[PDB]
Amino acid sequence: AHFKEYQVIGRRLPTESVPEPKLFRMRIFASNEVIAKSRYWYFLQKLHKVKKASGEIVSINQINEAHPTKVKNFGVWVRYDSRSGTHNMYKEIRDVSRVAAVETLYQDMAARHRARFRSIHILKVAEIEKTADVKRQYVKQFLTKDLKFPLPHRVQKSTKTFSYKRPSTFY
Amino acid sequence: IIQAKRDAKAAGSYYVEAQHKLVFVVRIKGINKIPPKPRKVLQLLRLTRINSGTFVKVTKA
Amino acid sequence: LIHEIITVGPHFKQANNFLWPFKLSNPSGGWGVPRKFKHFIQGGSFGNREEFINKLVKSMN
Amino acid sequence: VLKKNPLKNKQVLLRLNPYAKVFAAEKLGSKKAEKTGTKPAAVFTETLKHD
Amino acid sequence: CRQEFLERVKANAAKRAEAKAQGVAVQLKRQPAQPRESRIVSTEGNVPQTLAPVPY
RNA sequence: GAAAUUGUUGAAAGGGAAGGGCAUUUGAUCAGACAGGCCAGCAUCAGUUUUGGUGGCAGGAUAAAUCCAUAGGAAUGUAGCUUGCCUCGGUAAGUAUUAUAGCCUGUGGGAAUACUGCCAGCUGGGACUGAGGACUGCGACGUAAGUCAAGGAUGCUGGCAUAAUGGUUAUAUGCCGCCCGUCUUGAAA
RNA sequence: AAGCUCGUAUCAGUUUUAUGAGGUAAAGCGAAAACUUUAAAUAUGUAAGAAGUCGGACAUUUGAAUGAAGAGCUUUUAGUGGGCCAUUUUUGGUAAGCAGAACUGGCGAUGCGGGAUGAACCGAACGUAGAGUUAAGGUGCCGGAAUACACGCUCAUCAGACACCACAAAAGGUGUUAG
RNA sequence: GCCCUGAAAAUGGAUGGCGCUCAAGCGUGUUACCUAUACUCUACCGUCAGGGUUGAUAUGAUGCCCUGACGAGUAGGCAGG
């Protein structure tokens, strides 16, 4: 829905002569807790031989962002299994927070690839501090000096069905 | 609980909460185009009619 | 009785079977969720949500 | 004959479970708990932010 | 098939016998798996390790 | 001396369907009852329920942030410096880490606010329902007497006291509606 | 439907535990995957107690959960004996369609909302009425409901509004966006 | 990923029609919302069930009162009118 980012660890159950295994951690994006948990178990069953019955959860913690309103360039390495074999992808965002960036990503993948939330994988978020190592261009053009641009053809959303005025946009 | 987890976070440790022992259950789907084993189940748990519900103790079985 | 429930106690099965299945309305607010019959994990309505039942039920009361 | 509800009809709320009255006085969900500065661990916040 | 039932019966009567001998509550009926309780874990043997699901 | 069916008068309708159902209008028509019937309205109460305001609390990283100080860093390089044009101040390229703007990061400080949850917290508006019929009892208020919003609604008032409401009926109108029964009935025709 | 023993009890299209008549080897370490070596899963059997336990001894926490205190013995009576579709498994196969079995669910006796209409779809426990809330489906108008908000992509010289993997189908294309 | 082609007939003809193109299309997310004999609350009917009931023969004992759940239905059966 509207998204959150969560921190999870699983501590796969103490068996005799191997108590306290190695506390496998993930950072997982979802709107709530239990969805987050289920995705941890889903990735974990993929990544090594676990089941939920053979595993147990340590904690859930919402990861707030350190300095939200810092505008950030993010770059995200992802995978998705579309109808073909699975395949990788990188994308780049100018945005405010990790969570909002992946929100926009999920919708854009939905547009351009008919890509579902269920069949997306995130590998990784990263943040780029220095400019000019961003690979893409459509963010890169939003980085120039003394920037100005217009809102052409602005339209006003009236409640009424009539207008008596012969409207205009401006310009 | 809240003091414990606070103190464990101070300690660099993690409180695992008790796995809960009670649930509430609600029937959603109504009566028909049901498979029979679940029908028998719900007759045990008295969740016959729609938007009917109850408490249940938690265990393996 | 409530304490017996929540601290699920000795005389719990007997209290529960004293109690009827609760007959609930449908939700006052809506469910949300245009479709019900997928898992809650998938944005559905069924399954195990484990705290949001309380929201759901005060709506359904 | 008739279900008179609790959760309005305070009188029948008091006909039952009469701990309500001292709930009225002390009010017992506006219960200000005693705050303790007890900081979390540095390792914990480090694994929170950093991986 | 039933050898489990017989050895269970003799275990049952054994705990019956000792519980009748030394006066204690009997609790002879079986008990299922049950919901597990709280237990602190501290990450001192290992710090929490984070994962990279590429998968390859 | 019925009905099919036919005429005549009177009422009404009608653009390639008839009749049927639900609700109503218009018209025609109609019975009852006022030593107290019909329609309604206001207030306070109860069950049910919808929709707003507002307060107090708890949690998380005891929010994160903003904000204060501090250290360091760097540019889509602010002041300042150098060169060119010159429209004589704006470019160009260098300089310059705060200066004649500021930013990023690290630590520390003390708050509030968010989102979530709780209130046996206050208050308002709206709608439907008002079964039940001496008393019994569970309860509250109060020292008590007595009282109440507590085992199903009573108080005040007005109009009409009749075709006004209501009913019946033709009819308009919105929506619905496959022609009956039988035999195979699995395009079930 | 009637009796008689009773609600003592009875069981249940159910889970849990233990167990085979068998391994799927998805584990090769168990001879250089050679190996029955058995992580299991594919489910029937069995049971979870006086109907039991070693002449004589031991009562309901007397032996798991969960639900139903309506079950059982004998006698007797009406109607009824075939069939389409789907799904799961699996044998035979065909260009393809498929054929055969086994289980299960729907329809049959059965209306209602939606699907524009409808044997097979989706939802749904039918006395009459009121009020409320919703399911599946939908909200430009017909048509009751937002010409709602918001990210993207699309501009077809007969698009699409499809139920979807599915048949033309592998590809062509100096259309277009992202990788 | 969309888009065109990726083959079609022959009465005139259909995304259901109108018509729709920063959508009234397509994938997606948020909310509010309409709506069935479904669910809930209430009244009423009826049946079944559990209880109470000779005190004034309280004049219907096949009565009277209290409480609760439930109602589809062909062949067919039982019962009351």
Q: Which residues contact B44 (CB under 8 A, 6 or more apart)?
A: none
- Domains belonging to chain A, first-starting first, are 2-68 (3.10.20.10), 69-145 (3.10.20.10)
Residue found by looking up tokens 């990790």 in the block = A98
Cα separation, B56 vs B45, in Å, equals 8
Confirm or reject contact between E35 and chain B (CB < 8 A). Answer: yes
Tokens of C27: 């939700």
Residue D44 φ/ψ, nearest 5 degrees: -70, -50
> E54, A79 in Cβ contact below 8 A?
yes
Q: Which residue has the tokens 């939920």?
A: A52
Alpha carbons A104 and A106: distance in angstroms, whole number: 6
Helix, strand, coil shares, percent, chain C, to 5:
40, 5, 55
Residue of D16, A64, A20, C53 whose CA lies nearest to A10: A20
What residues 1-51 of chain D have any CB closer than 8 A to a CB of chain A? 47-49, 51
Rounded to the nearest angstrom, the minimum Cα separation between B55 and chain D is: 21
Which residues in chain B have their CB less than 8 angstroms from residue E33's CB?
Answer: 59-61
Structure token digits, residue A152: 């052409």
Q: Which residue has the tokens 């809240």?
A: B2
Taking the C1' atom of every nucleotide in all shown strands and the CA of D9, the nearest one is F149
Closest nucleotide to the alpha carbon of A83, via C1' = G165
Contact A25 D47 (CB under 8 A): yes
Question: CA C31 to CA A144: how far, in whole Å?
Answer: 47
Which residues in chain B (1-60) have CB-CB distances under 8 A to chain A?
14-16
In this structure, are strands B22-26 and E49-50 parallel, antiparallel, or unpaired?
A: unpaired
CA neighbor of A46 nearest in space, from C33, D19, D10, E54: E54
State the DSSP H helix or E strand holding residue B22, giving kind and residue range, or none if neither: strand B22-26
CB A76 within 8 A of CB A105: yes
